[PDB]
Amino acid sequence: FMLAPRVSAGGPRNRYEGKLVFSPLRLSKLLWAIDTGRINPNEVITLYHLRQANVVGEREIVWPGFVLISNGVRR
Amino acid sequence: KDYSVASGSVDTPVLDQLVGYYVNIQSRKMYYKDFLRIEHQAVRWAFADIRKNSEALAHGLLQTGLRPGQRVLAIQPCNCETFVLQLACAKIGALLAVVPHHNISADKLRFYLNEFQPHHLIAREWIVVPEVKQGVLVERNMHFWDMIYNVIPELGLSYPGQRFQWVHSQEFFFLKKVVITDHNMNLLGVTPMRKMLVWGPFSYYEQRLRRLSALLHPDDPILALEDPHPALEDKLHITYSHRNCINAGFLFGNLMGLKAESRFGVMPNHHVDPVGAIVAPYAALTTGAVLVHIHSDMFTDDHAINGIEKLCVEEVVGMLGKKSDFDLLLRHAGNFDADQYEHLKWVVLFEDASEPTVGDEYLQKLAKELGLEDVFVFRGPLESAYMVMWRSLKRARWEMVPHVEAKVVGDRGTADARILAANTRGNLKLKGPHISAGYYNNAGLLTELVDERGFCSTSREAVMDERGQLTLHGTQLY
């Protein structure tokens, strides 16, 4: 490992206090959850409703909460 | 009134494509309809012609050795072809530089050659320049050929290998061709080895201009103009892009009013500032109109009178200019009949913000003397293509040009800078489609900040009024 140089004194993928590392929430997961019948379409969907409906686990939750990613969804 | 920020209406549509695209569209829609009229060059062109010979000239420059990265330098005096070159250099994405010819020597020519380092030099042999005899402006035919051979002495020493040596001048090594433009009235064409091929199909399988145009982006700067009052030491030639020009033209054409085949005049010698270079011809292109050139120059009484005698024939329903050459029209308009001006309805004068405030009694004088319905005054810094705010004769209020935000901020921020108190001098930031944040320099193409909020630094300090009014200043020197 000493043959390899150091880079970026903190380290490449390094956490620091206040790096925004989001856990992903795929839009497909959400739409599946809505069309499956976990969640109200009628209602503003907060992170709270996601946790309560069980669609996201406690372990997944960390600061900052989530990112909405569109994975395999064209409409 | 409370704070220094100004915004125009956003309902006006914005054109984001390349220039060639709108040229093709406008060529398909109105093909046979007139585009520009010039009597002194015998040029009557349709949109057919402008498309056809624009891309033809593009191919001409491609075979003359021009490439999408490099620059062109153009000293042409009020021709049609400098506009054609705008379009051609737009199609191949080469930066065109237009420099004013009214004071030109060998020294500043070689300065331009040092600065832009152009591939091409678009020049003349005999050019018409104003000079002072007996306190009176008289035309001189400056022999520009002498100037070129003074700047580059090595073209005279001719050994019988030297059309083909790699560098024509060891001291300008980026010069490859010089395009001489003079109207030689001989009917015989020139020999094809000094003439570039402008006609016919340039290809077999597909033309390479639309293979290239996919690789060009609408914000690629192509044009450069002088700033006679530079914001800073650094900003020499402020630089324009596709959508800057297109949207300047469209905003002007939308704001005044322009309907197809209506006639639209330009006072000469405005091709070096964004009046006849940018606003006018693109206004004529974008909406259907007919651009009209009056006499090739302005600065003398004789061809001022010839100017009136032409514009009254050409049936121009409205024309553009600046105060200083409307002075000459005001001198010599009294000598003619009133009803001769019956077709002129509106007129436009453009203002750099360091002028400040052409007086409304002067506008009243124009309107009463020419029998005008309305006189329109546009004002803005030269980065903004001479339009930020505008007023009419009947409306003294300064209305903002749509899609324009002018703010005056503090010095402690970039994006997060705060609006001042509406009388206080602070930095000026302009956000608009027709505004340019690039400027060309000795160093090369340069850019000042375009931030997260979308605003853009001008490196100028300004004072906002309670009623919409901008006053530019030099930098604060305590």
Add this chain to the structure above:
Amino acid sequence: RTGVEWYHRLRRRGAYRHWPWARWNDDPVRQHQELSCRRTFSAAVTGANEGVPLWNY
């Protein structure tokens, strides 16, 4: 044929697991399509140019 990597490219091991990356049965020149002109104007002589040699043979 000695050496370490020649042992890896014969027993085709973990850099060479698919050895020669240019191997028979691919041709870059024709892409395995026959160059024959069926495009003939009159449909009678369609098979007129056939057996035009691709090389000396």
Add this chain to the structure above:
Amino acid sequence: DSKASFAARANFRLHAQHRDGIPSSSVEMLSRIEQVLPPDPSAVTFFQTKWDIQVQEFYESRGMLEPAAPLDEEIEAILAYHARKPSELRVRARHRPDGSTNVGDDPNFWAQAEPTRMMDGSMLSLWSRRTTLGANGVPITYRR
């Protein structure tokens, strides 16, 4: 200058077997003419022509729909190459999409265009190759 006339005009070959879409009299006449002619021309001469607006008026005045020239392929490839992130072309794993392991000693293998998929390609001996086709019709790389 009719429609079906134009269709038969655009699809013409000389000694054709059957011709559909045209009225019968014209078909019979063409049959006569092509029975008369030999397959071999006595003189051949050809010119070349560039597009102009008379094409448009030809298609629009007759209420037809003008054909367009498709965009270039290699320009699309160039744009698709220069558009992607620098981290799209780096090495993403121990195994190249072929299934071969890339040991770091060789610079040819420091680039990866297509992402490797370890959990795909187990079904290819049992399946038709038409499954391998990508979104644009180019076969994607599977681990074998």
Add this chain to the structure above:
Amino acid sequence: LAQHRMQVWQLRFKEMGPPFSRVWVALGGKMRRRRVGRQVDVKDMRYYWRPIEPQYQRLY
């Protein structure tokens, strides 16, 4: 619990991969002793991320 993830690895490398195949990648040192005189190609063969040798990867 994390005792063995030592930071001298975390400064040098970074792991990249899809599940069940992941490289650890590093940059090259030849650099900060002699740059000049060698050649530009052999110098900028140093700016690429590269997978570590598999023994070392297994070992770490």
Add this chain to the structure above:
Amino acid sequence: DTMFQYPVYENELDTPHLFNITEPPDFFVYWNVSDFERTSYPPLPEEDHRLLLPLSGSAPWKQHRKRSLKYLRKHEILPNYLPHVRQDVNLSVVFPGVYATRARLCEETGEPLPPPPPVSRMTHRNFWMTAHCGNYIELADLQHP
């Protein structure tokens, strides 16, 4: 200067100068705005060939027909679209061209320009308006039979 020379053909029937383009060598190129209305067609050759009777013993006809066949081969008509070409007769398909660059209209009305009188005899003015082997004719003049 055998290595430095602007390309000169002897048979421009393909009008290659429109297609194979070589840069003007001269450092000062002269480009007016007038030359946009100049049609750039190749110069009139000597030995106008379309007057030739296609006699089998005639040398100019021999060299012309071998030229035409080679032109047919380089544009890949001869092997490909049209496998067997017997060259018997000397053919000229001529068009009533006005040499006008783009499509025009009438200034007096706004009509399309009327169909020109069909050409009676071939002239030198008519020469590039024919169909040659390989050349280029504008679309604007091909509008009529």
Add this chain to the structure above:
Amino acid sequence: VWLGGTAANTSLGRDVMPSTGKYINIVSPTDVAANISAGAMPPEANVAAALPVPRIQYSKWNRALRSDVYDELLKLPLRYKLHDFAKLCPPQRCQEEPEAVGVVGRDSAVGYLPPLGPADPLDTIPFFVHRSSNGVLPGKVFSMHPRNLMPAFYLRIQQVEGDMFRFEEELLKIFPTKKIFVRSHSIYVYNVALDGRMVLHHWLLGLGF
């Protein structure tokens, strides 16, 4: 050394200029092409190469049903005929715009449909397959010995309830080469990755579950 040549002159589409005079005392592109000091620039340096674009991946949260995989199910000598592929996909976009649509069969961009029932009546399927509590179909792709991170994978099918051996006897037809094992709660298919999972799901959806 007189540096000159006809190279600087742009020649478009074929160079007809005399070729003995091209570059004079200047290195040609061929001279730098045979002389480069690097070696073997990588296969990904080819810019114009037409690279594949993957289709939309089948995930557990996205059922993107491919028609060709389904056709490779339809070629098999299976019993228990399947719903035609048009029915496994949800109703269309422009048909579903207004309030005129039913509640069970609603438009879903992910695509999710409640089980359609058997494609043929008057016939009894020996097994019955349960969806998960979240609507997911039972196949799970594990790895044999995940600690060493082995690429070797398998497929575990749990929620089968019925005669499981009929399930396996059709699963043989789906997977002729692979290894199948039976246990009270589950059915193992060996050396089958997400591909076979996609298939199992196409077959179970087509079967009416």
Add this chain to the structure above:
Amino acid sequence: NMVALRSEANTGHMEGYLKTETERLDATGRKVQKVLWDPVLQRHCLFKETKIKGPFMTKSAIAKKVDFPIGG
């Protein structure tokens, strides 16, 4: 010997240069200067000889203010 050819257009771009034995020879009292590609400007510029260990942008590296003939 090891010297640094640093841009005369002051971008602080330097390029390591090894003097030829003639230039290694003390025969002449001059700093070497050479036309090279300056990537920072994307242009060709003059480079000057300067010591490799030292700040490549020094204060003394400021050009005096030159008014340009062009424009008003």
Add this chain to the structure above:
Amino acid sequence: RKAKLFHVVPGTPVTPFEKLKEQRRRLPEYRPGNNVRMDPNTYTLYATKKGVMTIRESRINPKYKWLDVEPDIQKVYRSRELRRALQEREMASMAVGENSNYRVELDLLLEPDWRERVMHVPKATERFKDPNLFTRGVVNELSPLDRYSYT
């Protein structure tokens, strides 16, 4: 020392990325042939195109050789396949240049005099031809520096 070898089988198709031969600096043993590029410092042979590599030996001195890469692979493939098939059917002739035992004779019966054409030294007056030939254009090339015959 190090062992410097072939990285491909000669007579087998090869991609551009793969090395052909690693030489040792001594004129090199192997010189670049058609569609082959040599690293000037390393003397390592690379393939320009993608095709079949074959070895030429110089007719002058058999120990000095060229590596060639022939661009179309399937030509070589079906030529070799047919050739082999014939070999098994006893229908092939052993007189082709592919036969290494025969190539001497093959070069001999085609051009018998290639010895005396190689040994023939031109004088300076025909090596250096009077340039006005080149100026007037009687000859189109003037190349004083090819005095040596490489075949």
Add this chain to the structure above:
Amino acid sequence: VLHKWAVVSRSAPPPRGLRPIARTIPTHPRLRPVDYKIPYVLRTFIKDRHTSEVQHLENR
């Protein structure tokens, strides 16, 4: 060479069309051609390069 997948990527390379690379006789005495004489020609120095590369030419 730095491809686009590097860590650092540089600016545009010099356009080939300007300031070419001369084919110079190698000054290395082992790589120098035998007949190449050390060029002593006693000459008045012509300081501009335009004429000074004409001396290297025979076009008459």
Add this chain to the structure above:
Amino acid sequence: WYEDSSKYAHPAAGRRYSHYLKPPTERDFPATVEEYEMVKHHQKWHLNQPGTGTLLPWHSYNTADLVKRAAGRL
């Protein structure tokens, strides 16, 4: 909140004091002879650009909590 409250400075505030919640002094001009000397030196240090009036320190943190986007789609 940004487009209503935050992006506007204090109504009294001068350009130099713009960022402060309340202007520390009345007059915008630097109110200390030492501070004035320093501002003069700053305006001749950096050449005379518009923003040079306000002192910005020559040295940096290189810390991640002050850094913003280098370049990206707006």
Add this chain to the structure above:
Amino acid sequence: NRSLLGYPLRRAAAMEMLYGGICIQHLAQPPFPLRKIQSESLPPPSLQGERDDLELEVKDSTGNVMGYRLFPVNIGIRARTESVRVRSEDCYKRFLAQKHCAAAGVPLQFPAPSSITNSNCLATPRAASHFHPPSSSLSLFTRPADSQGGDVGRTTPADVAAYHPRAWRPYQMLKPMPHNWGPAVRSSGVRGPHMQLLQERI
């Protein structure tokens, strides 16, 4: 016939020789003879030849070089590379707008129309022919909000002008700011706020 030097010798040298070393006779030289080029001896026109005769700089794997020369120099390199990547991304997205809009016969509009891209994704055989729109359908307006007009609904707040459907926010941010890191520099790079700074505890 043949000559002992092979070319007919010009009179200048001749009369110069038999009036020993004197050129006063013909000094005005005739122009050189032409070499005619056979136009049918040329190869058939090739497509790739048409592709590369222009010699564009975009086929380099180092990056979009043409992009660099069309871009300002005022930006630190590591922030400029990811800038030029953004313009070469927009040229791609626009290339795709062109393609899909041409594929459905619709006049061009760009971010993208949805219904065009998605429905053209439903046909593999739609790649054959493209049709132009009629001249009536052709308009200058390439944004959807300029084209589609108003539709009834909007969600984002009305009090903010930045959320206006026709509002124009510039396409890319341009910052003159330098980049903070390079590999050959030892202590450089962006540090955690409570990490020790560069050269702390000297």
Add this chain to the structure above:
RNA sequence: CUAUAUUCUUUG
């Protein structure tokens, strides 16, 4: 490894 080099480049 630590210091001097702080843009695409550089020392022991």
